[PDB]
Amino acid sequence: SQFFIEHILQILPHRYPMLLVDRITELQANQKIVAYKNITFNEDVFNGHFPNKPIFPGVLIVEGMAQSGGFLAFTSLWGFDPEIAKTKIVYFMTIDKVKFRIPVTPGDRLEYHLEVLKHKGMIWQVGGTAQVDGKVVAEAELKAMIAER
Amino acid sequence: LQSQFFIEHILQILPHRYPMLLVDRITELQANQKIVAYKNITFNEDVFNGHFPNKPIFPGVLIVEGMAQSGGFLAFTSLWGFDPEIAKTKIVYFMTIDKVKFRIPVTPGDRLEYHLEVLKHKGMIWQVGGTAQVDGKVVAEAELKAMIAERE
Amino acid sequence: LQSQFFIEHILQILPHRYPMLLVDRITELQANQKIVAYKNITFNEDVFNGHFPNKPIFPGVLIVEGMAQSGGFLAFTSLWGFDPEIAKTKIVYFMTIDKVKFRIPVTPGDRLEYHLEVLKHKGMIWQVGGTAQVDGKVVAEAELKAMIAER
Amino acid sequence: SQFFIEHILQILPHRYPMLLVDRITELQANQKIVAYKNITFNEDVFNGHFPNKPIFPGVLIVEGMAQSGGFLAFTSLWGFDPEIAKTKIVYFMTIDKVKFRIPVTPGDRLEYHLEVLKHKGMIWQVGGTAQVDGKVVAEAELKAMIAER
Amino acid sequence: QSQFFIEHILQILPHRYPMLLVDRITELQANQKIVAYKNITFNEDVFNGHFPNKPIFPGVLIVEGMAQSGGFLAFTSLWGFDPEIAKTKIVYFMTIDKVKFRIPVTPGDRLEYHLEVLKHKGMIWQVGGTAQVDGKVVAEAELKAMIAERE
Amino acid sequence: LQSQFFIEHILQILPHRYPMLLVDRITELQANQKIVAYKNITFNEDVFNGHFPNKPIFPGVLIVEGMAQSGGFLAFTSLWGFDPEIAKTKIVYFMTIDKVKFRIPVTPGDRLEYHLEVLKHKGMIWQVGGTAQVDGKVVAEAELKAMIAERE
Ligand SMILES: CC(C)(C)c1ccc(C(=O)N/N=C/c2cc(Br)c(O)c(Br)c2O)cc1
Ligand SMILES: CC(C)(C)c1ccc(C(=O)N/N=C/c2cc(Br)c(O)c(Br)c2O)cc1
Ligand SMILES: [Cl-]
Ligand SMILES: [Cl-]
Numbered sequence: 001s002q003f004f005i006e007h008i009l010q011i012l013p014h015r016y017p018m019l020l021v022d023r024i025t026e027l028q029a030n031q032k033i034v035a036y037k038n039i040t041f042n043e044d045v046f047n048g049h050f051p052n053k054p055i056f057p058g059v060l061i062v063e064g065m066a067q068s069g070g071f072l073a074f075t076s077l078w079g080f081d082p083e084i085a086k087t088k089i090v091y092f093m094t095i096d097k098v099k100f101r102i103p104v105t106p107g108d109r110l111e112y113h114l115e116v117l118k119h120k121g122m123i124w125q126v127g128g129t130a131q132v133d134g135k136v137v138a139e140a141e142l143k144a145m146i147a148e149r
Numbered sequence: 150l151q152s153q154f155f156i157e158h159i160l161q162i163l164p165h166r167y168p169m170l171l172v173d174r175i176t177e178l179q180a181n182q183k184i185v186a187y188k189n190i191t192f193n194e195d196v197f198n199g200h201f202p203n204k205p206i207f208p209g210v211l212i213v214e215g216m217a218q219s220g221g222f223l224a225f226t227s228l229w230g231f232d233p234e235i236a237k238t239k240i241v242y243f244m245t246i247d248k249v250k251f252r253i254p255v256t257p258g259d260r261l262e263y264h265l266e267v268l269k270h271k272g273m274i275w276q277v278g279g280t281a282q283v284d285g286k287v288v289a290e291a292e293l294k295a296m297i298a299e300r301e
Numbered sequence: 302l303q304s305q306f307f308i309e310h311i312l313q314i315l316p317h318r319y320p321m322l323l324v325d326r327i328t329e330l331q332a333n334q335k336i337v338a339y340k341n342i343t344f345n346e347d348v349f350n351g352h353f354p355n356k357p358i359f360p361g362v363l364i365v366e367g368m369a370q371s372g373g374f375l376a377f378t379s380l381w382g383f384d385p386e387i388a389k390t391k392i393v394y395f396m397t398i399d400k401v402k403f404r405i406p407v408t409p410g411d412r413l414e415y416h417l418e419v420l421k422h423k424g425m426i427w428q429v430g431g432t433a434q435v436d437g438k439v440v441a442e443a444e445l446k447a448m449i450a451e452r
Numbered sequence: 453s454q455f456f457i458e459h460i461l462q463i464l465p466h467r468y469p470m471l472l473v474d475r476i477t478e479l480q481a482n483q484k485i486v487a488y489k490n491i492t493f494n495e496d497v498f499n500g501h502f503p504n505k506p507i508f509p510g511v512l513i514v515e516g517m518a519q520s521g522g523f524l525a526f527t528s529l530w531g532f533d534p535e536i537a538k539t540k541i542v543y544f545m546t547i548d549k550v551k552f553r554i555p556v557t558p559g560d561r562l563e564y565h566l567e568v569l570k571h572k573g574m575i576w577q578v579g580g581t582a583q584v585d586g587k588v589v590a591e592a593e594l595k596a597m598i599a600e601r
Numbered sequence: 602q603s604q605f606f607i608e609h610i611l612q613i614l615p616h617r618y619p620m621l622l623v624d625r626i627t628e629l630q631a632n633q634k635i636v637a638y639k640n641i642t643f644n645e646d647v648f649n650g651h652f653p654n655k656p657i658f659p660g661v662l663i664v665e666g667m668a669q670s671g672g673f674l675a676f677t678s679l680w681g682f683d684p685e686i687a688k689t690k691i692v693y694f695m696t697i698d699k700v701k702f703r704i705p706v707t708p709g710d711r712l713e714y715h716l717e718v719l720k721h722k723g724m725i726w727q728v729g730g731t732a733q734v735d736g737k738v739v740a741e742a743e744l745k746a747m748i749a750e751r752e
Numbered sequence: 753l754q755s756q757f758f759i760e761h762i763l764q765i766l767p768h769r770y771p772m773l774l775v776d777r778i779t780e781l782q783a784n785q786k787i788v789a790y791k792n793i794t795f796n797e798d799v800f801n802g803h804f805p806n807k808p809i810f811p812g813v814l815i816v817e818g819m820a821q822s823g824g825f826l827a828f829t830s831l832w833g834f835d836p837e838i839a840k841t842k843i844v845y846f847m848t849i850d851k852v853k854f855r856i857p858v859t860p861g862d863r864l865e866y867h868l869e870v871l872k873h874k875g876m877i878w879q880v881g882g883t884a885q886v887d888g889k890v891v892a893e894a895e896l897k898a899m900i901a902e903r904e
């Protein structure tokens with residue numbers, strides 16, 4: 001269930017500054033994942049969002065949830081397989097029911113909670129929340145398709 | 150009351166700065182009704198170092214972000230017009246995002262055009278929806294409700 | 302050989318990478334004769350943090366760089382066609398620049414179009430010249446000579 | 453005693469990408485300070501330290517400890533006074549007895565524990581450790597000087 | 602009056618990171634010539650893309666560094682070290698001519714700009730000179746600029 | 753075997769990369785003994801955006817990092833000679849740092865010269881010591897122990 005940055009880098013194609021998942025704490029095939037990304041002032045994004053008021057972009061919180069969800073889907077089908085990971089692309093088709101409740105700032109441990117709402121073939125629907133210190137800071141539902149890279 | 154604004158005017162209204170100011174120019178603006186704007190996409194952008202190596206694709210979420218900033222400009226200017234002084238005291242926040250669909254990937258060389266329409270507005274609360282287009286084709290769709298709050 | 306290439310093709314031919322690959326797409330290519338290409342200008346470019354604060358202006362020298370990169374792409378595809386393997390066994394370097402004029406400032410939102418024609422070419426030495434345009438208006442002119450070399 | 457990034461910004465002169473303290477959890481004038489910095493893969497430093505193997509630079513761990521000490525120094529001297537702070541900068545004078553025991557990586561919450569060893573005027577000597585999940589990842593002593601910009 | 606460091610340069614030139622390419626002024630004779638330089642280090646972003654595994658300071662940036670040196674010369678010739686007046690002026694570079702690159706510039710080099718006033722007629726300044734590394738000429742260039750009121 | 757190495761040679765030995773490769777050239781090298789190298793300091797470096805705004809000062813800790821990297825180059829070449837294929841899978845870990853003292857601020861325009869001497873080495877563990885200099889003056893002094901290791 002625990003995957004670190006090294007493991008993550010072998011499954012996801014994302015690299016700096018768009019790999020928004022630092023560690024995976026829980027993974028239940030075909031069911032759910034709990035992962036997180038540490039938020040620190042030392043991130044380029046804060047230079048512009050916003051000057052004198054660092055706030056992690058809501059859309060990037062969603063991106064982080066999507067990446068966690070994609071990791072879940074890929075792993076549920078193929079497990080930890082770097083080889084096969086390079087032959088697949090997990091792109092997102094839709095995003096819906098997104099709600100932002102609390103602003104995420106430097107010092108926050110942005111935890112992603114996604115579960116498989118539904119899946120058929122290579123189409124997977126995940127949903128859940130983003131949490132900081134046990135509180136729900138955002139929620140969203142996403143639908144992704146898995147295909148040959 | 151103007152319909153065209155360039156980056157210098159955008160900078161005076163939106164608080165966003167590099168690397169999160171995703172609107173380069175506004176070509177159409179109709180108070181309380183709609184806005185048409187765009188962001189040029191070029192390889193010379195840091196995001197492409199990671200999305201993805203050897204396969205530059207503009208992140209769908211940033212397409213949405215650009216749509217929101219456009220809506221936000223529309224919301225503000227609809228209420229106060231081009232007023233930099235007051236703009237510095239307000240900030241627009243994403244409350245919700247719905248019905249997002251990504252149809253075509255956006256890549257360097259593309260002119261990402263935002264088309265937002267006002268679906269409903271009451272005071273500081275604005276609901277907009279629209280599409281992101283490239284050479285006339287819809288590459289993305291989205292609806293979102295924003296909030297015009299105090300910067301402090 | 303084709304007449305249009307996208308960023309994916311340009312990455313396979315030019316050795317330039319971020320933040321110095323200043324050509325996004327190729328629209329017209331006529332071997333040993335001319336090329337029309339362009340680079341989109343956006344505020345979301347690091348260059349603008351320093352050129353200048355509160356007033357984004359695409360550096361004139363980078364417009365020339367862009368023209369040079371277009372020239373280099375023409376030069377190489379003229380001699381080897383679309384060949385990624387041979388391409389990576391090369392680099393191109395500026396030898397001279399002349400008659401450059403900066404008529405109109407280039408800013409975010411602009412589609413910087415490069416128009417180059419081969420003035421002269423002999424082996425790895427190419428002499429190109431032309432203009433940089435925005436919405437059909439000349440914003441800059443320049444002549445440059447470059448060379449493709451081994452590694 | 454609970455300071456956030458915007459408070460830290462008003463005291464320390466450091467800015468991106470050299471501001472390495474995200475939050476202050478404990479503060480006791482002329483005694484000690486406990487703070488932390490989140491470590492995420494989304495930090496430019498990791499592009500070069502090292503490729504395919506992200507390790508937060510040991511020297512930056514020390515820098516983060518120094519900044520923590522600096523904040524303790526500024527406040528111990530003038531309390532939380534953004535106006536006086538804005539005129540100053542901080543200079544490293546000495547560094548000694550530093551030992552790194554465990555590598556810090558993306559996903560880690562790097563906590564700084566510094567106490568005052570000695571001080572006089574603008575010159576402050578502090579020492580302590582850097583910890584992750586309650587375990588000491590580094591030790592250090594350092595002397596710094598606050599000066600007029 | 603002769604030696605200006607980075608603090609001073611920052612107060613006269615509007616350029617900022619990543620486009621301020623002059624680190625220190627070592628010699629300045631009002632209305633005559635300027636000698637200044639920029640250190641080249643591998644720890645510069647441009648090297649990420651110019652070129653991977655082969656760091657080479659872009660030729661166009663050498664010309665930019667020369668342009669900046671000329672601008673500081675022109676400005677200081679007219680008003681001396683005056684940060685306040687500096688904030689209200691701009692120097693548009695109109696043309697670049699006869700540039701030639703003889704030796705590549707790389708990390709570890711101390712790129713020295715040697716500019717001299719070729720002509721000054723009104724708001725127009727024509728400067729020229731060379732860029733040198735360890736006493737050897739690595740580049741040559743002529744440039745014409747216009748002094749104007751900021752806005 | 754050689755005594756002078758340029759940035760291309762440094763890239764083939766040290767694992768560090770942008771923005772953490774802080775050695776531009778090697779001017780002297782005596783196996784298992786000493787090394788003299790330097791890094792040019794320029795305003796055009798990202799660290800200066802934050803250390804400090806309007807007052808560029810090369811971070812003291814990065815000076816130490818530069819000395820360590822100098823020692824590392826010395827350590828590796830003393831072990832396997834100039835062997836890029838072997839160096840390709842090694843990394844360097846800081847173990848300790850002692851008696852570091854900063855005497856003069858390093859600023860843009862400075863040629864930061866590292867002078868390291870081997871105080872003791874055994875296997876992968878090198879205990880190196882020396883100074884950093886600008887125009888013949890001691891700008892800093894430090895003692896450090898680093899360990900060369902294989903990427904696992
Ligand atoms: C949802 C839609 C239609 C806009 C879409 C479709 C495809 C893609 C896509 O191609 N994503 N990733 C593609 C990709 C990534 C890497 Br890495 C790669 O080596 C290759 Br070939 C890819 O096609 C993204 C969005
Ligand atoms: C942002 C602001 C107002 C400082 C600004 C705006 C435009 C420009 C510009 O288009 N060109 N040049 C500015 C400039 C000023 C001096 Br004094 C100088 O030595 C050089 Br060379 C310049 O390029 C420069 C600065
Ligand atoms: Cl947001
Ligand atoms: Cl995407």
Ligand SMILES: [Cl-]
Pocket residue numbers: 359360361362694
């Ligand atoms: Cl320019």
Ligand SMILES: [Cl-]
Pocket residue numbers: 508509510511844845846
């Ligand atoms: Cl380390």
Ligand SMILES: [Cl-]
Pocket residue numbers: 394395658659660661
């Ligand atoms: Cl060049």
Ligand SMILES: [Cl-]
Pocket residue numbers: 542543544809810811812813
């Ligand atoms: Cl320091």
